[PDB]
Design a protein around this nucleic acid. Structure first.
Ligand SMILES: COC(=O)C[C@](O)(CCCC(C)(C)O)C(=O)O[C@@H]1C(OC)=C[C@]23CCCN2CCc2cc4c(cc2[C@H]13)OCO4
Ligand SMILES: [Cl-]
Ligand SMILES: [Cl-]
Ligand SMILES: [K+]
Ligand SMILES: [Mg+2]
Ligand SMILES: [Mg+2]
Ligand SMILES: [Mg+2]
Ligand SMILES: [Mg+2]
Ligand SMILES: [Mg+2]
Ligand SMILES: [Mg+2]
Ligand SMILES: [Mg+2]
Ligand SMILES: [Mg+2]
Ligand SMILES: [Mg+2]
Ligand SMILES: [Mg+2]
Ligand SMILES: [Mg+2]
Ligand SMILES: [Mg+2]
Ligand SMILES: [Mg+2]
Ligand SMILES: [Mg+2]
Ligand SMILES: [Mg+2]
Ligand SMILES: [Mg+2]
Ligand SMILES: [Mg+2]
Ligand SMILES: [Mg+2]
Ligand SMILES: [Mg+2]
Ligand SMILES: [Mg+2]
Ligand SMILES: [Mg+2]
Ligand code: NA
Ligand code: NA
Ligand code: NA
Ligand code: NA
Ligand code: NA
Ligand code: NA
Ligand code: NA
Ligand code: NA
Ligand code: NA
Ligand code: NA
Ligand code: NA
Ligand code: NA
Ligand code: NA
Ligand code: NA
Ligand code: NA
Ligand code: NA
Ligand code: NA
Ligand SMILES: [Sr+2]
Ligand SMILES: [Sr+2]
Ligand SMILES: [Sr+2]
Ligand SMILES: [Sr+2]
Ligand SMILES: [Sr+2]
Ligand SMILES: [Sr+2]
Ligand SMILES: [Sr+2]
Ligand SMILES: [Sr+2]
Ligand SMILES: [Sr+2]
Ligand SMILES: [Sr+2]
Ligand SMILES: [Sr+2]
Ligand SMILES: [Sr+2]
Ligand SMILES: [Sr+2]
Ligand SMILES: [Sr+2]
Ligand SMILES: [Sr+2]
Ligand SMILES: [Sr+2]
Ligand SMILES: [Sr+2]
Ligand SMILES: [Sr+2]
Ligand SMILES: [Sr+2]
Ligand SMILES: [Sr+2]
Ligand SMILES: [Sr+2]
Ligand SMILES: [Sr+2]
Ligand SMILES: [Sr+2]
Ligand SMILES: [Sr+2]
Ligand SMILES: [Sr+2]
Ligand SMILES: [Sr+2]
Ligand SMILES: [Sr+2]
Ligand SMILES: [Sr+2]
Ligand SMILES: [Sr+2]
Ligand SMILES: [Sr+2]
Ligand SMILES: [Sr+2]
Ligand SMILES: [Sr+2]
Ligand SMILES: [Sr+2]
Ligand SMILES: [Sr+2]
Ligand SMILES: [Sr+2]
Lengths: 53, 337, 132
RNA sequence: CGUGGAAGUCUGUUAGAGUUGGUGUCCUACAAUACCCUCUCGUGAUCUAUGUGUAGGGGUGAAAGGCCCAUCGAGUCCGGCA
RNA sequence: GCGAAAGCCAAGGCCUGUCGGGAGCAACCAACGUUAGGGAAUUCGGCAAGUUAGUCCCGUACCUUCGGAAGAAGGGAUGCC
RNA sequence: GGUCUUAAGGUAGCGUAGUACCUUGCCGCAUCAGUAGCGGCUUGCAUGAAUGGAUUAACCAGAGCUUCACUGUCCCAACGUUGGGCCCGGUGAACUGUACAUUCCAGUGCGGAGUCUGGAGACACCCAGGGGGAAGCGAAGACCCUAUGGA
RNA sequence: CGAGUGGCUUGCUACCUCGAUGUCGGUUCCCUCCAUCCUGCCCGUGCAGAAGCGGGCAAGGGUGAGGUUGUUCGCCUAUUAAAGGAGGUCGUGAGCUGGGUUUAGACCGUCGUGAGACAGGUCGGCUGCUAUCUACUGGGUGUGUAGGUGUCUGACAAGAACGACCGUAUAGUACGAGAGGAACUACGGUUGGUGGCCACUGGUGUACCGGUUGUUCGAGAGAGCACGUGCCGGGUAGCCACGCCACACGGGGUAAGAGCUGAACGCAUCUAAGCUCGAAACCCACUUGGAAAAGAGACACCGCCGAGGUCCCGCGUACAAGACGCGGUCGAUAGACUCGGGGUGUGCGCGUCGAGGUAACGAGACGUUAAGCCCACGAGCACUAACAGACCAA
């Protein structure tokens, strides 16, 4: 699988899946990505992220 | 009428003091069933990783599916069974009779023992056989040591010596099986005793925490509410009633916590291999890199990284052996991050 | 009960105010008790995803309000562990009102459900719009 | 609408005065009444320095038997008195 | 900055609110920071802690001795160039 | 009862009250559940008119209750920060002490014993700890009675 | 109606303490009792089944959360297998709390001429001490057994290390007209307890990196202070729980009970001798401690002029002192360096753009730059430091 935020490959047997109000599903690879998302930041704007580079 | 509540902590792991030997000592051994064999082995704790595995359990609704299982990596290099000790049945229990040693010894065994220069392996063997004829022979155990030199992450070279029982067939056939292992040079591997998928009992001397209070050591409550601000936070209510006018040893008190011997029952051996397949990127934290004979134990194992853990075939298994589990994936991801 | 197929860290307690994920007329539910549970001294009785709980209706229609009904915990904020190691958490804490035979009191269910709840309570599944 | 700027008026760790809770700290104390935070008043029946007056069954008291030099339901000292 | 407020800094003063050295420095204690999910279930009692907060705009109930209630409540704004 | 004591015989109001014994009074509100709180009723053990009654805007470090918000008060505890604590140099008290004293379980005894009796246990010394016991230390009991005591 | 047991209630007595044995309730922590609430095994039934009622053995484990009330008690709610009762100075203030009783202030009602009173109500109203002995939890030093290293034995000791529930198959089956509706057994899970561990999720993380407010160092750069991080965002290692792993079956002997054989008493009889069974209870099994077990233990090797140990040195798998463990050049023990593995989030400077502005000036944007900075982990690497050397000892 791939992280719906940064874009790196989520190591199997790791990570969290956040289920939104409408039913949408967001797989995260780490807490760092979850926290950046909660801050309202979009992955495209952060240079360390694979979705950006 | 004041609610009931189970006591704080168990009274069966006492006295909660520092262990005499850092090398664990089994107090029980498996029953004599099929073919003769050494009833144990030993390794050195490396660290932890996870494994994706295929469900072996026939009674599970998930039989055949991918399941993530936590695993403790333990480096298990070949050990040397340097002698055969024999016990005799005396009216005062089992007392050691004689020992049958070797000629071939490891270069750095002299760091622990006063290595034998002059011994008679035949007179010793004769004394043991005269005892078997008399019907006085108890059990047959092997004096065994580890080769920490084979493990680059463990600083020590000084071998950890421990006694291990040989059980199985008849007392005549296991005497012969024991003498064969010894007379060669004593070299045996994890494979000789264990097969992946079997249940083992891991014994180890826990992580030392020095002195800790009742809350950590016995799991007692902290002072609650208003009582927490008065000058008492982590101290118990009282040391006992007015009568008996003494403090009972059963009351939760401060002292040594950790560095105790524990024998963790029914641990599944996920895989026994050789190489660098379970090693973590950047190396196991506070340990190092694994590239040699290893064992993957399901879940946790007592003691810190670098500590000597002991293995023994489960004396009380609950489940039937489901041999050689299919390992789909082993994580090599850095333990830092 | 039947195994969930997931390890749950109970995110709710007795007295917790949760959402009512249905069209029964009940908007907010308050947890009173948890079916089959027995705690220990000083411990607040804990409820989590997949538990059958007893609730009181805090907010809603005059007829539904104040009623002591049984419910099933469908969604929770605190993570649960799936067999593949992955954690699954929700946006809110929610429950669906149920009857004596475990059939939903309402007709339509609002928001998603966890697949483990669906397998345990079948008639709640065959009413679920989204199953994650 | 503006002007005016009243008030035992309001906010306020301005100065200054006071002392609600923590039943915190201390409790052979830093201290025979202390420390910290919190809290109240702060243009008035306000607070304060100095000088001055009222003296013991007497003063003084917005009154608690409060206070009158760590002493008060009758100060202190010495005497009566062994 | 409203300010004899905070915080920071001059002038001036001081290192004398006058015993030091050592141990990632344990238990325990005093002061205190941060704690997932739940959110007063704690307790005689929200005690303790926390929440709110400056300024401008909008807007503001019952009651009332018409003075007040009232900063009711609630909502929005706020930097730099 | 349909007057009598002793002059009158409780009027407006308020009322289960900071006054109500019975009492958690009865009904209602609110809560899953409310000896609480508020409203109503109210025969008030033993309310009531400057011994002032009722009522009341505003004010309050005054007593009780409810809601929103908030949170380590709690579930249930964790990790961290500073000063101690611990070891070393220097300085250097006090409380307390009939004697003996390694105690424990029972018993006995002025009936609540480390010291008596019977057993059990017990090699000596030292370090740290939280305070079970010494009916621990501190104060010739402020309660109670007594004194041909005091004020 | 009669006979008793207990010592939880109440009453009685006045033996003990008035040169003081701190009063209720609560809390916290430990042990116990059985007259047993649940759980195990049983007997009876107005025992079809299911669900009950009553009784017996049995104290292993459990017996929980909440609303009013200071309450104990009790009433009430929802859960539960059940939400039993009692003793330990009505266990527990040199542990806590201080809501009630019961000081000094005040109010109300009643009583009193009055001061003032009340086994009436109400608001307010303080919690001392540096542990000598003993006791226990853990830690050391000596001596005894009588040179050393390593491995063991097991007298004794501790444990609840396990308790309980739900679900599925059995089975819509046995039973019953129907309604309704089991069990043996095999499985999956949950809960409480217990021990351990950190790959995973989570917390912390005043290591670290970044953003940013005020002020000071002229600006810039780069920094100090704002409580022991100014605040905000992220967060490695470690430590942790809210995370994860593990915690039988079976034997043996019994209780209540069900029986066999069997006599006294030709019969009968579970009992008198004998025997087969039979509880979550007892013993074993399992875990932990344990040569100071004074019968003070066993084995193997080394050594008595030398085995081994201590000091010393570099360090932690250890640690409050002490202790413990490892390494010491025949070396990777620690540091430096370089990689690897990680944290943060794109450095200074320069170039282009930039709303505008005559210009000066200019917040900011892009590139250089997966940049810069940083790391409590790993590897490589003898460069630096584990050197020199001392002592005890049959
Ligand atoms: C009426 O109650 C009191 O007076 C309590 C007290 O005053 C407490 C004194 C505490 C001190 C000052 C000695 O620390 C007192 O002296 O009690 C005595 C007292 O003080 C030592 C102890 C007494 C004597 C017999 C045991 N008992 C224990 C405490 C107590 C408690 C009481 C009691 C008497 C006692 C006595 O009346 C009912 O409640
Ligand atoms: Cl407490
Ligand atoms: Cl409940
Ligand atoms: K007394
Ligand atoms: Mg990690
Ligand atoms: Mg990760
Ligand atoms: Mg409680
Ligand atoms: Mg004057
Ligand atoms: Mg929280
Ligand atoms: Mg409570
Ligand atoms: Mg407060
Ligand atoms: Mg009322
Ligand atoms: Mg009149
Ligand atoms: Mg006296
Ligand atoms: Mg008196
Ligand atoms: Mg007089
Ligand atoms: Mg005492
Ligand atoms: Mg009985
Ligand atoms: Mg018991
Ligand atoms: Mg008591
Ligand atoms: Mg006490
Ligand atoms: Mg006290
Ligand atoms: Mg004290
Ligand atoms: Mg009161
Ligand atoms: Mg009072
Ligand atoms: Na204190
Ligand atoms: Na006491
Ligand atoms: Na005017
Ligand atoms: Na003050
Ligand atoms: Na005032
Ligand atoms: Na006088
Ligand atoms: Na009157
Ligand atoms: Na805190
Ligand atoms: Na004590
Ligand atoms: Na009796
Ligand atoms: Na008490
Ligand atoms: Na029992
Ligand atoms: Na109650
Ligand atoms: Na007492
Ligand atoms: Na006290
Ligand atoms: Na008490
Ligand atoms: Na048996
Ligand atoms: Sr052994
Ligand atoms: Sr043993
Ligand atoms: Sr206190
Ligand atoms: Sr006693
Ligand atoms: Sr004023
Ligand atoms: Sr007070
Ligand atoms: Sr102080
Ligand atoms: Sr004081
Ligand atoms: Sr405080
Ligand atoms: Sr003011
Ligand atoms: Sr005189
Ligand atoms: Sr200066
Ligand atoms: Sr000096
Ligand atoms: Sr943080
Ligand atoms: Sr409350
Ligand atoms: Sr409450
Ligand atoms: Sr606003
Ligand atoms: Sr009337
Ligand atoms: Sr102490
Ligand atoms: Sr006195
Ligand atoms: Sr009995
Ligand atoms: Sr029963
Ligand atoms: Sr009582
Ligand atoms: Sr009652
Ligand atoms: Sr008790
Ligand atoms: Sr009362
Ligand atoms: Sr009274
Ligand atoms: Sr009081
Ligand atoms: Sr001797
Ligand atoms: Sr069934
Ligand atoms: Sr049916
Ligand atoms: Sr600072
Ligand atoms: Sr702020
Ligand atoms: Sr029998
Ligand atoms: Sr010995």
């Amino acid at each position: 699988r791939e992280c719906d935020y940064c874009g790196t490959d989520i190591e199997p047997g790791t990570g969290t899946m956040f289920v939104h109000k409408d039913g949408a599903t967001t797989h995260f690879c780490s807490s760092k990505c979850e926290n950046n998302a909660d801050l309202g930041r979009e992955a495209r704007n952060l240079e360390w992220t694979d979705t950006a580079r | 009428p004041q609610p009931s509540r189970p006591r704080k902590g168990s009274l069966g792991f006492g006295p909660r003091k520092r262990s005499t030997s850092e090398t664990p000592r089994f107090n029980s051994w498996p029953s004599d069933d099929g073919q003769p064999g050494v009833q144990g082995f030993a390794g050195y704790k490396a660290g932890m990783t996870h494994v994706v595995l295929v469900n072996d359990e026939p009674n599970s609704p998930r039989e055949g599916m991918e399941e993530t299982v936590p695993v403790t990596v333990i480096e298990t290099p070949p050990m040397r069974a340097v002698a055969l000790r024999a016990y005799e049945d005396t009216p005062y229990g089992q007392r050691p009779l004689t020992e049958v040693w070797t000629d071939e010894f490891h270069s750095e065994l002299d760091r622990t023992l006063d290595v034998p220069e002059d011994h008679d392996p035949d007179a010793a063997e004769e004394q043991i056989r005269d005892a078997h004829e008399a019907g006085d022979l108890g059990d047959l155990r092997l004096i065994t040591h580890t080769v920490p030199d084979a493990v680059p992450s463990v600083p020590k070279k000084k071998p950890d010596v421990m006694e291990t029982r040989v059980g199985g067939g008849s007392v005549s056939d296991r005497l012969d099986h024991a003498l064969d292992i010894v007379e060669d040079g004593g070299e045996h591997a994890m494979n000789d005793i264990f097969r992946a998928g079997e249940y083992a009992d891991v014994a180890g001397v826990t992580k030392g925490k020095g002195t800790q209070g009742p809350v950590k050591r016995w799991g007692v409550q902290k002072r609650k509410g208003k009582h927490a601000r008065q000058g008492w936070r982590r101290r118990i209510g009282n040391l006992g009633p007015w009568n008996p006018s003494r403090v009972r040893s059963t009351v939760p008190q401060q002292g040594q916590t950790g560095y105790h011997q524990r024998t963790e029952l029914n641990k599944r051996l996920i895989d026994i291999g050789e190489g660098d397949e379970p090693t973590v990127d950047g190396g196991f934290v506070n340990y190092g890199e694994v590239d040699g004979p290893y064992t993957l134990v399901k879940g946790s194992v007592p003691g810190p990284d670098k500590r000597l853990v002991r293995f023994r075939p489960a004396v009380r298994p609950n489940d039937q052996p489901r041999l050689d589990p299919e390992v789909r994936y082993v994580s090599n991801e850095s333990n830092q991050g | 009960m039947e195994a969930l197929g997931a390890d749950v860290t109970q995110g709710l307690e007795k007295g917790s105010l949760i959402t009512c994920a249905d069209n029964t007329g009940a908007r907010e539910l308050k947890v009173i008790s948890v079916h089959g549970y027995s705690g220990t001294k000083n411990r607040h009785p804990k409820a989590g995803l997949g538990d059958k709980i007893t609730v009181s209706v805090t907010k809603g229609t005059p007829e539904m309000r104040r009623q002591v009904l049984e419910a099933v915990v469908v969604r929770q904020r605190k993570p649960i562990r799936r067999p593949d190691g992955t954690r699954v958490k929700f946006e809110d804490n929610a429950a669906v009102i149920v009857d004596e035979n475990e059939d939903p009191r309402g007709t339509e269910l609002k928001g998603p459900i966890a697949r483990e709840v669906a397998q345990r309570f079948g008639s709640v599944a065959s009413a679920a719009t989204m199953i994650v």
